[PDB]
Design a protein around this motif. Structure first.
Motif, short mmCIF file in Angstrom:
data_model
loop_
_atom_site.label_atom_id
_atom_site.label_comp_id
_atom_site.label_asym_id
_atom_site.label_seq_id
_atom_site.Cartn_x
_atom_site.Cartn_y
_atom_site.Cartn_z
N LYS D 136 34.77 37.29 32.18
CA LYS D 136 35.06 38.32 33.03
C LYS D 136 36.44 38.91 32.72
O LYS D 136 37.55 38.29 32.91
N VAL D 137 36.32 40.25 32.39
CA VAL D 137 37.58 40.82 32.25
C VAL D 137 37.82 42.24 33.04
O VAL D 137 36.81 42.75 33.51
N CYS D 138 39.08 42.46 33.35
CA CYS D 138 39.34 43.59 34.22
C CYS D 138 40.73 44.41 33.58
O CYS D 138 41.76 43.91 33.77
N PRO D 139 40.43 45.44 33.14
CA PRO D 139 41.36 46.30 32.54
C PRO D 139 42.64 46.58 33.55
O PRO D 139 42.22 46.91 34.72
N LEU D 140 43.72 47.09 33.30
CA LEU D 140 44.74 47.37 34.12
C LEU D 140 45.59 48.61 33.71
O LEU D 140 45.54 48.83 32.15
N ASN D 141 45.97 49.67 34.46
CA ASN D 141 46.93 50.55 33.85
C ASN D 141 48.30 50.06 33.95
O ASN D 141 48.45 48.86 33.97
N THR D 142 49.26 50.87 33.78
CA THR D 142 50.58 50.41 33.55
C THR D 142 51.27 49.54 34.52
O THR D 142 52.13 48.94 34.33
N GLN D 143 51.08 49.79 35.75
CA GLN D 143 51.78 48.74 36.79
C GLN D 143 50.79 48.00 37.57
O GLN D 143 50.73 47.89 38.84
N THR D 144 49.68 47.51 36.85
CA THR D 144 48.86 46.20 37.55
C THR D 144 48.10 46.90 38.48
O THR D 144 47.98 46.42 39.79
N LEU D 145 47.03 47.87 38.44
CA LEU D 145 46.24 48.55 39.15
C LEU D 145 44.90 48.30 38.65
O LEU D 145 44.57 48.64 37.45
N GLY D 146 43.70 47.86 39.54
CA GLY D 146 42.62 47.71 38.80
C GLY D 146 41.79 48.99 38.35
O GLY D 146 42.09 49.94 39.08
N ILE D 147 41.06 49.06 37.55
CA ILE D 147 40.37 50.21 36.87
C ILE D 147 39.06 49.83 36.59
O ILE D 147 38.67 49.14 35.69
N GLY D 148 38.06 50.53 37.64
CA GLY D 148 36.83 49.91 37.48
C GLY D 148 36.44 48.52 38.20
O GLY D 148 35.30 48.22 38.20
N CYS D 149 37.53 48.07 38.66
CA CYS D 149 37.32 46.33 39.01
C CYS D 149 38.51 46.29 40.01
O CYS D 149 39.48 46.93 39.87
N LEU D 150 38.37 45.20 40.92
CA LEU D 150 39.12 45.08 42.02
C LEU D 150 39.69 43.71 41.81
O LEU D 150 39.22 42.68 41.63
N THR D 151 41.16 43.78 41.92
CA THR D 151 41.88 42.60 41.49
C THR D 151 42.23 41.75 42.82
O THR D 151 42.65 40.46 42.62
#
Lengths: 267, 49, 48, 268, 264, 265, 41
Positions: D136-151
């Motif tokens: 299960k992988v969840c990419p992030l932008n530069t300051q740790t905000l979910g992109i296409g997924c909810l952290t």
């Protein structure tokens, strides 16, 4: 090819020159005493202060000295083993420190179709697994045992039992028979070659119960074997954090292995 | 909206001292004098990091 | 006479402040999370 | 003698020049089940004996199912040959098995319950081995905000593999990610692809060739350590691979990590 | 500036954009997210792309993707999901999307025709196109078929959404098509296209971009990769994008240089 | 590569087959009442000298119909356009879109605004039914004569059209409100002259131009015209001097996709 | 925004001829700052 083994180095004394990973191993005693859920992250942020970028420190957990003993694994450019002291687990502490602090190259071992021997002084036999009880016999030239009749095992001269890990040394100059607990252990014939700089040991408590060679004349304490006293685990962890530059200065990285096993198996 | 994770503790002064002292090795001279003749500026201080 | 160019190059730190001086005059709003992806159906049980 | 300090080496083009090498063969099941004998090993042994190879030097370790053989393939032996029984439905696993056991991966472990991570170069991959891995992988932008997924929870990420025993992900370089697996089921290790491994030769007995070792789309090479033969009776496959085992052996070479001179160069 | 001449160039030995992705619908169906294009846009930003110029286009089936094919974009990476069924269709599709085709129309109710060079083909596209042929003697008389017949013809393709037809040349043939259902253009291949790269998923690199049997010219543009999930493919696409960009060149027709030299 | 555009050719003063198809509107063949006319023009061009099967024919049922994505196929096109006293603007904009080649980009209309940079930048909207609504905005980004929230007070410049050539004032952004599923607008630059196509008008005087510029509206040496009552005289006359039309065109300008424009996303 | 730039472009393209050169040099002597480049406007 050989990187240069037969074209020697040239140097001088007249010239003035003026992401890596680090792991930790801790016994579950600490996981008990901590009583937190977010602690490893704190340790990460700390090793940040001391010079490690985030994503460069990992933690591993072992539950017993005896448990971690079987099939060692290493995982980082630098391995730090935090060992608890005990008074009835001394030979196990020394055997583990010997195995992980020292290199080994071994061939497999059997009982079926051979006898075995050491060709020299600096060879040892290693046994690891779930249940390892080792009994052994030497012979004469007559292929006859002296002190154990070759056909019957109960009066054998045992060396190991009720144990997980054993590193035994037998005398050169004669074949051997062994009652290894085969399906419940495994044994190899290894040659130690030289020290390694990819492991270090920090012993909490106790009074230097260690020898890295079973030689009575040479019990060589090295600069990598460190010993501090403890009554509170956080103090141990912090104080380790405070001299991580020193510890990195005591180790060296050019000796890492490819597999995560601290030896080299070559059938 | 999220519980805010914390900062990253800035690298301490001491190892900083040691590492900058270390970087003194690969310094060239000719280039150093050339650069030293040139005047930098505020904009030319930070716009290279 | 080239002083104006060396000047405009040099004193280019203060600009930063000014920008947030715009921001302190600026309104700000946030936008709640949106729920992406398709959504399952649901009809009705046999109604008698 | 002088180790680990890479110093130049003088050869020459002026002088022409006028056993302990141990084959270690593996094999799958249905082959055996069709062989219908328990002495076939001994026949292979005596044949190798007549070919110039010692008796007691060759050992047969058997793998049951390809997905079973995927875990912990510590193929420790002087020279290794893997005959894989091809599948027209199980392909990607064969490709990645080849990839793994034909290259050298130096990897460090991870603790995904705590740390963010990010890949570094086109030679950095994430190997994942064990029983039943569900990444299960969840990419992030530069300051740790979910992109296409909810952290703020765990079950809304983007899965990349399900019902796999061994899978090697490659991620977009230079971005941080959140990760989850069941860390009592299987383990993931962050490996750097150091350099090609030469101890092993993999040959496939079945349909068409699919093998590529580069996760690069552009470069899909055909190395020499990857061979293919047809079959309708496994007997001929064994007999033949022993008929040309001379050429196979001359193709491979000694493992450049255990040579007593590869000291302090990653495993010796 | 100076077009329309073939003016030798000298030299010496001392001296925005658009990345364009097509995808099959079943993929996004398996994805079940919708903001995904925005996610991959952010990632392409991170690899260096301008924000808000990368476009994803959606085709229902490769047959559908075959009819009215039009690529207008600086850098096209086209994915194709293999099937052991349409090997001819995919081959000739990659072909039509690999070359520059100088094309003119045809009327098969009023003339005969021919192929005059080995770089000449007859391409057909339409809804339900099924063409028949009858080669003609030097006396303009049919063989095994008659210009008066329409059934003794020799069938060459059947309801194929697309077809790339070729025959022995230097010889005339009377055909059979449905023009208010299908169009057949007489086309000539000239060079390879640099705006397209065909990534096949699944399969074994089976393409053939020439009706030439004697060679199977494999190139640097027909790439292949395997899959178990779609985001896998898309991540491989985005991360490895730079070498792909190095493969595909600017459209040699596009530059304001090919003017009046059969410029697109 | 570059073919040498950076190198200048030098010359001296010492040293002293293609296709051709014809476009026509249905009314002609209608008054012809036959099927054996195409045979006729074919064999006749064959006689005047062309390997047979080199002259083709498309038909267009209506100026409005052919006004949807014109595809100038042949290396030479001689389009016979029919004049009407009421369809002037459509004829003009078509005649423009085909003599000069255009470099065209698509527009995103409900997400951004648009502006034209050069003097020779235009928009061309095509569709079965086209309706163009435009609302300029000044610097401060507000509507003027048009409330951006609504669209009813906008300035309607086209209604259910088949083709529209629109121009705005260079560099003042607009809100664009268009029928999106029945028409598409393409932002295009007029590259220059194309040399494969000529247009022969039959009917009234010359309305056709090639510009939207006031001061320039010249009878282009290519844009020909004749009188007519019987289309057979039209075709025959074309075939008579057809060599002159050849010698006016240039067979080194054919496009490689056969559309009036070059699509560039 | 571009439009005022173009108008000023046309303006500057015709005020390159109605300038003096001697006074130009003798101006270029003195140093300019933020205060005299846009505060005497």
């Amino acid at each position: 090819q050989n990187y240069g083994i037969n074209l020697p180095i040239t140097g001088s004394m007249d010239i003035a020159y003026a992401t890596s990973t680090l792991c930790l191993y801790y016994p579950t005693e600490a996981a008990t005493e901590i009583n937190d859920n977010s602690w490893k992250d704190t340790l990460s942020q700390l090793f940040l202060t001391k010079g490690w970028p985030t994503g460069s420190v990992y933690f591993k957990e072992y539950t017993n000295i005896a448990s971690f003993s079987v099939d060692p694994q290493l995982y980082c450019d630098y391995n730090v083993v935090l060992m608890k002291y005990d008074a009835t687990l001394q030979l196990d502490m020394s055997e583990l420190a010997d195995l992980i602090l020292n290199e080994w190259l071994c061939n497999p071992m059997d009982i079926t179709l051979y006898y075995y021997q050491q060709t020299d002084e600096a060879n040892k036999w290693i046994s690891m697994g779930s249940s390892c009880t080792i009994k052994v016999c030497p012979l004469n030239t007559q292929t006859l045992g002296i002190g154990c009749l070759t056909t019957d095992a109960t009066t054998f001269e045992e060396v190991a039992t009720a144990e997980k890990l054993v590193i035994t040394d037998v005398v050169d100059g004669v074949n051997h028979k062994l009652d290894v607990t085969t399906a419940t252990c495994t044994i190899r014939n290894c040659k130690k070659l030289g020290p390694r700089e990819n492991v270090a040991v920090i012993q909490v408590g106790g009074s230097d119960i260690l020898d890295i060679t079973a030689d009575p004349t040479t019990a060589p304490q090295t600069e990598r074997m460190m010993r501090i006293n403890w009554k509170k685990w956080w103090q141990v962890f912090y104080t380790v954090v405070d001299y991580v530059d020193q510890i990195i200065q005591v180790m060296s990285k050019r000796s890492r292995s490819l597999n995560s096993a601290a030896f080299y198996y070559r059938v | 909206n999220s519980v805010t994770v914390r900062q990253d503790l800035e690298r301490q002064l001491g190892e900083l001292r040691e590492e900058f002292n270390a970087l003194s090795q690969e310094i060239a001279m000719s280039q150093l004098i050339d650069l030293a003749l040139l005047p930098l500026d505020m904009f030319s201080m930070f716009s290279g990091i | 006479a080239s002083l104006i160019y060396r000047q405009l190059l040099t004193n280019s730190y203060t600009v930063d402040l000014s920008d947030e001086i715009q921001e302190i005059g600026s309104t700000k709003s946030q936008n709640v999370t949106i729920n992406p992806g398709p959504f399952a159906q649901t009809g009705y049980a046999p109604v008698n």
